[PDB]
């Protein structure tokens, strides 16, 4: 697993790149996959820069923090822009949770340095909403 | 809901105080409540500084980020300190997730300020592992 600030931030950046693609370039694919009639689905981004919409981890507690569950359920009950914003915020929160899981053993200064790296990338919420 | 940097840190510090108590002073009761015989359980910390072990939220998708699911399923196969450390890191991650959920509308410099305040308190993992 990632342990150094550099390793963790590389992992963060790769997962983020995947989720950014899901919510922008591939947004029509992502949206279509989130059918409200299916079982609870989550949006995952992986360090190989792939994104997927899938069921949550079958075995619990999961090795990593898990994304928001059941994002598909609300898809057809709100305007698209509002649903994508909801997905984006939960995705930003998940990326942070994953990095600081890997970063549990970093000291206070290292954790601040890692957040600083993360904070130099616009949030998915910023991107999807087109924030000024 | 908390919106300013200060409001979000107040909420964070109260939930953290609750979780820290569960993992230390109240650990005998907390450990007991994480019954492997039950369905999947979670550890919640609330802004009134109460901690609670309960099933996950039924409202799906939930409003707030959700804590780690099924910590009771890991309790008996680990040494107590290792299990508490696992709960501690997932709980630290949940606290961060909750704060930056409330903080989604903060800008880059506001989020930096918020993290600086959060980063002024030892993490739950810091305390549980003796760092």
């Amino acid at each position: 697993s990632p342990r150094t600030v550099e390793e963790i931030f590389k992992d963060y950046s790769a997962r983020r790149a995947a989720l950014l693609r899901a919510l922008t370039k591939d947004v029509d694919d992502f949206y279509s996959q989130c059918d409200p009639e299916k079982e609870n689905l989550c949006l995952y981004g992986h360090p190989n820069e792939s994104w997927e919409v899938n069921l949550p981890a079958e075995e619990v507690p999961p090795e990593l923090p898990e994304p928001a569950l059941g994002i598909n359920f609300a898809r057809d009950g709100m305007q698209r822009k509002d649903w994508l914003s909801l997905v984006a915020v939960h995705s930003d929160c998940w990326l942070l949770s994953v990095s600081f899981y890997f970063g549990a053993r970093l000291n206070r200064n290292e954790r601040k340095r890692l957040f600083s790296l993360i904070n130099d990338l616009p949030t998915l919420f910023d991107v999807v909403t087109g924030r000024k | 809901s908390p919106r300013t940097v200060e409001e979000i840190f107040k909420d964070y510090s109260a939930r953290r105080a609750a979780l820290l108590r569960a993992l230390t002073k109240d650990v005998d009761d907390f450990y007991s409540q994480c019954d492997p015989e039950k369905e999947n359980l979670c550890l919640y910390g609330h802004p009134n500084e109460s901690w609670e072990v309960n099933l996950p939220a039924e409202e799906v998708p939930p409003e707030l980020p959700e804590p780690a699911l099924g910590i009771n399923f890991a309790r008996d196969g680990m040494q107590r300190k290792d299990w508490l450390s696992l709960v501690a890191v997932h709980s630290d991650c949940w606290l961060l997730s909750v704060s930056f959920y409330f903080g989604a509308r903060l800008n880059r410099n506001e989020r930096k300020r918020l993290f600086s305040l959060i980063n002024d308190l030892p993490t739950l993992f810091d305390v549980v592992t003796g760092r």
């Binding site: 619990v60 | 999947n40 099924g70 196969g77």
Partner: peptide
């Protein structure tokens, strides 16, 4: 075991 299938 330290994991089980998630509850239904």
């Amino acid at each position: 075991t330290t994991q089980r299938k998630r509850s239904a």
